[PDB]
Design a binder for this molecule. Structure first.
Ligand SMILES: Nc1c2ccncc2cc2cnc(NCCCN3CCOCC3)nc12
Length: 338
């Protein structure tokens, strides 16, 4: 793919690459000048020339055709696909150019969190956008800060010599949801593994089956990450992941522990985890009950955390819906009209 995506390369006799926006395992996203739409800047995802990413981009194109047609004004904040083409046997998908991923925005400010006012606006929009997928018999499955992007370059940035980086200050926090290559329809076959490990629901970890509620878990993890500036589940390993959930959210429902065929992780009805090993005293030291991450006892911080705690309900049958979520008191402040 190195061979086909340099600056100055022209795709489909119109898209001139000017910059790289994002890399990763699926392939590359590049900024292009569209010489056939009056020099409008767009994004083109170049898909890695492999079975996996080919069929996932074929599916993504089908999903976007449906979302974009159903919601032409993008009221529900899903990215607009403009077209797709083939370039040296890679699928390329053209998109409206958005601003920074929320991931890159936090990362490049030294992992400093978003303001509560911004998080309220962003959480509302994420919940409204993914509730639209929910309404339309879809689950995203891979919600994570890399897949939430600012609509606009609506920030200022200044070089701060004291700390030798640009700091970027958000003016307007409006977002859209991207990447529908994993999005699964209610009646389609359901992959065993889904989500980036840090945002993966407990029912996905435990192979108990999944649908719309696994997205709600992911959003929960996103929101605390926006509030703190870092993931509360940093780990690579599922048993440590489950130890961290226990430390932060309490014990897992016995029914989930006893039902799972991933019995590898467990011993009788307990997590099989030496709490007193140096790896367990790590998790203990690293993790505290969820409500202790609060930076303020201020009621608006209490509203957010009550929502976050509902999103991280272990039992996906009991987990809050985005329908209910949009009605949570954390959002009331958005609906002020006196
Ligand atoms: N980075 C993207 C844009 C940047 C600017 N404007 C429009 C964009 C549209 C995109 C549409 N799709 C994707 N990515 C698909 C999945 C990539 N994610 C998940 C993996 O980590 C990287 C981000 N990225 C996109």
């Amino acid at each position: 793919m190195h061979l086909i995506c340099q600056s100055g390369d022209v795709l489909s006799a119109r898209y001139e690459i000017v910059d790289t926006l994002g890399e990763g395992a699926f392939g590359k996203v590049v900024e292009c000048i569209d010489h056939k739409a009056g020099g409008r800047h767009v994004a083109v995802k170049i898909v890695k020339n492999v079975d996996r990413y080919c069929e996932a981009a074929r599916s993504e194109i089908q999903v976007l055709e449906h979302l974009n047609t159903t919601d032409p004004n993008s009221t529900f904040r899903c990215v607009q696909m403009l077209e797709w083409f083939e370039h040296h046997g890679h699928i390329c998908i053209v998109f409206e150019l958005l601003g920074l991923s929320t991931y890159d925005f936090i990362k490049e400010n030294g992992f400093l969190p978003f303001r509560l006012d911004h998080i309220r606006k962003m959480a509302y929009q994420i919940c409204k956008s993914v509730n639209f997928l929910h309404s339309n018999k879809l689950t995203h499955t891979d919600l994570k800060p890399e897949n939430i992007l600012f609509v606009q370059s609506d920030y200022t940035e200044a070089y701060n010599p004291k700390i030798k980086r640009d700091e970027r200050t958000l003016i307007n926090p409006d977002i859209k949801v991207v990447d529908f290559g994993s999005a699964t329809y209610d009646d389609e076959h359901h992959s065993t593994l889904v989500s980036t490990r840090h945002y993966r629901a407990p029912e996905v970890i435990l192979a108990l089956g999944w649908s719309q509620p696994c997205d709600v878990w992911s959003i929960g993890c996103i929101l605390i990450e926006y509030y703190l500036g870092f993931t509360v589940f940093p780990t690579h390993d599922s048993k440590e992941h489950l130890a961290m959930m226990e430390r932060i959210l309490g014990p897992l429902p016995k029914h989930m522990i006893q039902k799972t065929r991933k019995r590898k992780y467990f011993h009788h009805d307990r997590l099989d985890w030496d709490e007193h090993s140096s790896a367990g005293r790590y998790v203990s030291r690293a993790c505290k009950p969820l409500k202790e991450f609060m930076l303020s006892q201020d009621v608006e911080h209490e509203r957010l955390f009550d929502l976050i705690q509902k999103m991280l309900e272990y039992d996906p049958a009991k987990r809050i819906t985005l329908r209910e979520a949009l009605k949570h008191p954390f959002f009331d402040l958005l609906k002020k009209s006196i």
